[PDB]
From a paper:
ExoY virulence factors are members of a family of bacterial nucleotidyl cyclases (NCs) that are activated by specific eukaryotic cofactors and overproduce cyclic purine and pyrimidine nucleotides in host cells. Here, we explore the Vibrio nigripulchritudo Multifunctional-Autoprocessing Repeats-in-ToXin (MARTX) ExoY effector domain (Vn-ExoY) as a model for ExoY-type members that interact with monomeric (G-actin) instead of filamentous (F-actin) actin. While Pa-ExoY requires actin filaments (F-actin) for maximal activation, Vn-ExoY is selectively activated by G-actin in vitro. The catalytic domain of NC toxins can be divided into subdomains CA and CB, with the catalytic site located in a groove at their interface.
On the basis of these structural data, we designed a minimal functional Vn-ExoY module (residues 455–863) by removing the C-terminal disordered residues 864–895. This Vn-ExoY module (shortened by 32 C-terminal residues) shows similar catalytic activity to our original Vn-ExoY412-873 construct and allowed the determination of two additional crystal structures: (i) nucleotide-free Vn-ExoY bound to actin-ATP-LatB and profilin, with a sulphate ion in Vn-ExoY NBP (Vn-ExoY-SO42-:actin-ATP-LatB:profilin), and (ii) Vn-ExoY bound to actin-ATP-LatB with its NBP filled by a non-cyclisable ATP analogue 3’-deoxy-ATP (3’dATP), at 1.7 and 2.1 Å resolution, respectively. In contrast, the Vn-ExoY-3’dATP-2Mg2+:actin-ATP-LatB structure co-crystallised with 3’dATP shows an ordered Vn-ExoY:actin interface. This corresponds to a distinct conformational state of Vn-ExoY NBP that is more competent for catalysis. Vn-ExoY undergoes significant structural rearrangements at both the CA and CB subdomains between its nucleotide-free conformation bound to actin-ATP/ADP and profilin, and its 3’dATP-bound conformation in complex with actin-ATP. Near the interface, the CB subdomain of Vn-ExoY undergoes the most drastic global rearrangement with a large 25° rotation as a rigid body around the hinge regions 532-533VnE and 662-663VnE. It thus acts as a lid (hereafter referred to as CB/LID for residues K533-M662VnE-LID, corresponding to K86-M209PaE-LID in Pa-ExoY) that closes on CA to stabilise 3’dATP binding. The conformational changes induced by 3’dATP binding bring several regions of the Vn-ExoY CA subdomain closer to actin, increasing the buried solvent-accessible area (BSA) of switch A from 338 to 707 Å2, reaching the BSA value of switch C (810 and 766 Å2, respectively). In the Vn-ExoY-3’dATP-2Mg2+:actin-ATP-LatB structure, switch A ultimately contributes to the stabilisation of the nucleotide base through interactions with M726VnE-switch-A. Mg2+A is pentacoordinated in a square pyramidal geometry by two aspartates D665VnE-CA and D667VnE-CA, and H753VnE-switch-B, which are invariant in all NC toxins, an α-phosphate oxygen of 3’dATP, and a water molecule.
Residue numbers in the entry:
A (entry chain A): 4 to 40, 51 to 371
B (entry chain B): 466 to 863
The structure:
C-alpha cells in the first residue's frame, strides 16, 4: 500500500510530491551550488548565492549534468519529501523528444543509485492534458528553458507533429533585462536577473493588438506601472510590460528566425489527420510558467482564428494552476492503481537493463 | 442557487444572523482591501467583542509570542492581560499554573512589565451599560472606592474602583481582594511604553492562489541570529533584512523566535497587514505566523473567525460557473468579512476556496476534538483534481 512519488524535473523548478495529492509538496530551483573557494541544492544554494557558483543540471528540458542531477534527486527524496526511495515507485517527467540515451541514463540512476521498486517516465505535455480531464487535444507547454507543441490523440502524443521552440521564460527575462536598458536602467548580474524575473511575472501581459498597444504607450502614460526594487528605489515600466511576452508570438524580437507560438500551434495541428484537427482546435491546452501572462489565451484565440478555417471552433484552455499542470497530471496517472501495469519493476530492470524504459 | 460539487452540497443562507465581532469595522475594511490587493484569503481568529474600543483607540500595543499569558474576556480587566491568570479567559483558568508562570516569566525576563489597570468613565459606561459585564457602581463607604461585580462562569467576584488623577487624566484604578485585603489589580504592560497590552490579531490561515505557489510557501522553523546570518548572503537582502543582519536585537525582536513557524509569504504579508492598518513602531496587531503552522493549536478557540477574500468571490457566480457567490452560502457583513462560526463551516469554506484555486495549509491539530478529521490532505483535495482523475480513468480504460 505504498504511495508513488511524482517528480517534474524542470529547467528552472523541480516540482515533487506524492501521487494522489492535488499539488506538489516541494517546489524549488533546479540548481546545485558549489563553494567558490560541500554542495547545496535548491533553496539553500540560492540563499547562500554570494558564496557559491550555481549550475543548472537541466538545459532546455533535457538533463545535461548527471552528477548534479543525482544531487537534485537525492535532495528531493531525503531532504524535501523525507522518504526512503527504495520503498516508493517513482514517476519522473521528461521533455517531448527526450533522447533515448537520456531516459536510459535516468532509468539507470533510479534503479542503481536510488534502488526504487518501480518507475515510469511520462511526457510532460501529455500529463498537462490529463490534468485538464482530457486525453485528446494539443498542448502548448512553455516553462523556463523550452517550449513545445504536443498534439495528443486518445492518450498518445503524435510524435511527427511535435514542435520544439527553444524560446521560454529565461529568454524572456534576458530580453526584459536587455530592453530595460532602452529606458536607462541597467540589470546585468545573476541577482539583478532575479529582480527582472520578478518584474516580468508581476507586470508583464500579452497585448491583444500589439501595434495598437505600442501606439497607446507612445502617446500616453496610461499603461505605465511602478516597481520598487529591494533597496527602495522605484522604477517605471511602460511598453516593456507587453513587448517582453510579445517575443513568444514574434521571436524575431530576440533574433530567432522561428515562427511564433500561434504559428507552431497551427502548423502542428496541420501535420495531424484531418479527421482529428477539429478535436485539436477545440482542445488547445496551455501549461507551464511562461503561459501565465494575462491576455495570452485571448491573443492565442485571436491568432489561431485568423489562421484556421472560418468553420472551425477554436478553444484555449488555460487553467489558473497551469504552472503545475504537468505535476498534477503525473499525480493523476500514478494514483490510478489500474495503471500499476506499465510501471517498470526493479526485477525487470535487473534482467533487461536500461532499455526496458522504451 | 445551490453549491453542488461532487459530495459537497451547500444550501443558501436562510435568515442571515448578525454576529458581533471584536475587530473594529475599519480594521475589517482594511483587511478586505488587503485580501483584494494581495489576491489572498486571510483568516483571523476571534477577538472578544469587548476588546473593540480598546483596539480601535490605537492607544495600546498588543501581545506577541513572548507574552503567552491570555487576555481576559470578563470584568473590569476585559480586553487586558491580567498578571494573575485566574482573572483571564477560560482557556487560561483551565491550566492556571502554566498561564501564571507565562505571565510571571514574561515580566521577569523583561518582555513585559507589571502595570496598574486604569479605566476611564467611557470604558466603565461601556462595561456597565453596553455589555453589562459589570454591575452598577455602589459607593462602598468603608474604603471610598466604588464596588462592582463580574461573573467568570458560575462565580461572582467583586472589584473596587478608586478615582485617581494620573498624567492630568481623571481615571478609575481597579482594585480587588487579594487574600482578604484590598490590592491594586495588575495587568501585563508593554516593555518599552509600560502601558497595558491588548490581545493581538492571530492569523488563522492565509490561502494563496495555486498559480503563485513557490519557495515562499515553505514553512520554516525559527533560526538564531547566527544561523540566519550564515544562511543568507548580505548583498541579496533588502534594507529591512540588512538591518537585522547588522543588529542582533532587531533580528530577535522582529524575526526568528518572535514569529514562530512561518513562511516567507506570511512574513511579508504580516508587514503589509500592519502597514495597511497604520500599526507600526510597536503598535503592530499581527506578530507571528498563522495557526495553520501552530503545534499548540486549539480548534475550539479558533471561532468565530473573520475571513477576507478577493472581491471576485462576491460577484455573480464568483465561485465559478453555476456556483454562485460567497455571500450566498456564508454570512458576509457590511465590511466584507466572511464570518465562519465552527469547524464544519470552516471545512466547507476551505473546500470552496480550494475549488476556486486558493491553497489550504492544513494543521493536523485542527482535527483534535472533531468527530471526524475534516482537515486532511485527502479530504481537502481539489474537485478539479478529482474530476480530471475520474475523466482520465474513464477515457483511458483505467
Ligand atoms: N506569473 C508568471 N508570469 C510570467 N512568467 C512566469 C510566471 N510564473 C512563472 N513564470 C516563468 O515560468 C518559468 C518557470 O515555470 P515552469 O516551472 O513551468 O518551468 P520548468 O518546468 O522549470 O521549465 P521547462 O519545462 O521549460 O524545463 C520561469 O521562466 C518563470 O519566470
Ligand atoms: N505559527 C506559530 N508558530 C509557533 N507558535 C505559534 C504560532 N502561532 C501561534 N503560536 C502559539 O499560539 C499562541 C497564539 O495565541 P495567543 O494570541 O497567545 O492567545 P489567544 O488564544 O489568541 O488569546 P488572547 O490573544 O490572549 O486573547 C502563541 C504561541 O504560543
Ligand atoms: C523564486 C524562483 C523562481 C524561478 O522560477 O526560479 C527558476 C530557477 C532559478 C535559479 C536561480 C535563482 C537565483 C534561484 C531561485 C529562484 C526561484 O532561475 C530562474 O529564475 C531563471 C533565471 S531568470 C528566469 O526567468 N529564469 C528560474
Ligand atoms: Mg516544465
Ligand atoms: Mg491572540
Ligand atoms: Mg497571538
Amino acid at each position: 500500500e505504498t504511495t508513488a512519488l511524482v517528480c517534474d524535473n524542470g529547467s528552472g523548478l523541480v516540482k515533487a510530491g506524492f501521487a494522489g495529492d492535488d499539488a506538489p509538496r516541494a517546489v524549488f530551483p533546479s540548481i546545485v551550488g558549489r563553494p567558490r573557494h560541500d554542495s547545496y541544492v535548491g533553496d539553500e544554494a540560492q540563499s547562500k548565492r554570494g558564496i557559491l557558483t550555481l549550475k543548472y543540471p537541466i538545459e532546455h528540458g533535457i538533463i545535461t549534468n548527471w552528477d548534479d542531477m543525482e544531487k537534485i534527486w537525492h535532495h528531493t527524496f531525503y531532504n524535501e519529501l523525507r522518504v526512503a526511495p527504495e520503498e516508493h515507485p517513482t514517476l519522473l517527467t521528461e521533455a517531448p523528444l527526450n533522447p533515448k540515451a537520456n531516459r536510459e541514463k535516468m532509468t539507470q540512476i533510479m534503479f542503481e543509485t536510488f534502488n526504487v521498486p518501480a518507475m515510469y517516465v511520462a511526457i510532460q505535455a501529455v500529463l498537462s492534458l490529463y490534468a485538464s480531464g482530457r486525453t485528446t487535444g494539443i498542448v502548448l507547454d512553455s516553462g523556463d528553458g523550452v517550449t513545445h507543441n504536443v498534439p495528443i490523440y486518445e492518450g498518445y502524443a503524435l510524435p511527427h507533429a511535435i514542435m520544439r521552440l527553444d524560446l521560454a521564460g529565461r529568454d524572456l527575462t534576458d530580453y526584459l533585462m536587455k530592453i530595460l536598458t532602452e529606458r536607462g536602467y541597467s540589470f546585468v548580474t545573476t541577482a539583478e536577473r532575479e529582480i527582472v524575473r520578478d518584474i516580468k511575472e508581476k507586470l508583464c501581459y500579452v497585448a491583444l493588438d500589439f501595434e495598437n498597444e505600442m501606439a497607446t504607450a507612445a502617446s500616453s502614460s496610461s499603461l505605465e506601472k511602478s516597481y520598487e526594487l529591494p533597496d527602495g528605489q522605484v522604477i517605471t515600466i511602460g511598453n516593456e510590460r507587453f513587448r517582453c511576452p510579445e517575443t513568444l508570438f514574434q521571436p524575431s524580437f530576440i533574433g530567432m528566425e522561428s515562427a511564433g507560438i500561434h504559428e507552431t500551434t497551427y502548423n502542428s495541428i496541420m501535420k495531424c489527420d484531418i479527421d482529428i484537427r477539429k478535436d485539436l482546435y477545440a482542445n488547445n491546452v496551455m501549461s507551464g510558467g511562461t503561459t501565465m501572462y494575462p491576455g495570452i489565451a485571448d491573443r492565442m484565440q485571436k491568432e489561431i482564428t485568423a489562421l484556421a478555417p472560418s468553420t472551425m471552433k477554436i478553444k484555449i484552455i488555460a487553467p489558473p494552476e497551469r504552472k503545475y499542470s504537468v505535476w498534477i497530471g503525473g499525480s493523476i496517472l500514478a494514483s490510478l492503481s489500474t495503471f500499476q501495469q506499465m510501471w517498470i519493476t526493479k526485477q525487470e530492470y535487473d534482467e533487461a537493463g536500461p532499455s526496458i524504459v522504451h | 442557487k445551490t453549491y453542488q460539487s461532487r459530495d459537497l452540497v451547500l444550501e443558501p443562507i436562510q435568515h442571515p444572523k448578525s454576529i458581533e465581532l471584536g475587530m473594529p469595522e475599519v480594521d475589517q475594511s482594511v483587511l478586505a482591501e488587503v485580501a483584494e490587493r494581495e489576491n489572498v484569503i486571510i483568516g483571523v481568529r476571534p477577538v472578544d467583542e469587548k476588546s473593540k474600543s480598546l483596539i480601535a483607540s490605537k492607544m495600546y500595543s498588543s501581545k506577541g509570542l513572548f507574552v503567552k499569558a491570555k487576555s481576559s474576556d470578563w470584568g473590569p480587566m476585559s480586553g487586558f492581560i491580567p498578571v494573575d491568570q485566574s482573572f483571564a479567559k477560560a482557556s487560561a483558568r483551565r491550566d492556571l499554573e502554566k498561564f501564571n508562570e507565562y505571565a510571571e516569566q514574561s515580566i521577569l525576563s523583561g518582555n513585559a512589565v507589571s502595570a496598574n489597570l486604569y479605566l476611564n468613565q467611557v470604558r466603565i459606561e461601556e462595561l456597565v451599560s453596553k455589555y453589562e459585564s459589570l454591575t452598577p457602581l455602589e459607593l462602598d463607604v468603608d474604603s471610598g472606592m466604588y464596588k462592582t461585580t463580574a461573573t467568570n462562569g458560575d462565580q461572582t467576584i467583586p472589584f473596587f474602583l478608586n478615582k485617581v488623577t494620573v498624567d492630568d487624566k481623571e481615571l478609575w484604578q481597579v482594585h480587588y481582594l487579594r487574600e482578604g485585603e484590598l490590592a491594586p489589580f495588575k495587568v501585563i504592560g508593554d516593555p518599552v511604553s509600560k502601558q497595558p497590552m491588548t490581545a493581538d490579531y492571530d492569523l488563522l490561515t492565509v490561502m494563496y492562489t495555486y498559480g503563485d505557489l513557490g519557495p515562499q510557501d515553505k514553512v520554516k522553523q525559527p533560526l538564531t541570529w547566527e544561523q540566519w546570518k550564515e544562511s543568507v548572503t548580505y548583498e541579496d537582502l533588502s534594507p529591512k533584512y540588512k538591518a537585522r543582519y547588522d543588529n542582533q536585537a532587531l533580528y530577535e525582536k522582529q524575526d526568528g523566535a518572535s514569529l514562530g513557524m512561518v513562511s516567507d509569504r506570511l512574513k511579508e504579508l504580516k508587514d503589509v497587514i500592519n502597514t495597511s492598518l497604520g500599526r507600526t513602531d510597536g503598535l503592530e496587531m499581527v506578530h507571528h505566523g498563522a495557526d495553520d503552522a501552530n503545534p499548540y493549536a486549539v480548534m475550539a478557540d479558533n471561532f468565530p473567525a473573520t475571513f477576507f477574500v478577493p472581491k471576485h468571490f462576491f460577484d455573480d457566480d464568483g465561485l465559478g460557473e453555476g456556483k454562485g457567490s460567497i455571500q450566498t452560502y456564508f454570512n458576509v457583513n457590511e465590511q466584507g468579512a466572511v464570518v465562519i462560526q465552527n469547524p464544519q463551516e470552516f471545512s466547507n469554506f476551505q473546500q470552496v476556496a480550494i475549488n476556486a484555486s486558493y491553497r489550504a495549509s492544513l494543521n493536523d491539530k485542527w482535527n483534535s476534538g472533531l468527530d471526524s478529521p475534516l482537515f486532511t490532505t485527502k479530504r481537502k483535495l481539489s474537485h478539479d483534481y478529482l474530476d480530471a482523475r475520474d475523466e482520465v480513468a474513464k477515457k483511458l480504460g483505467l
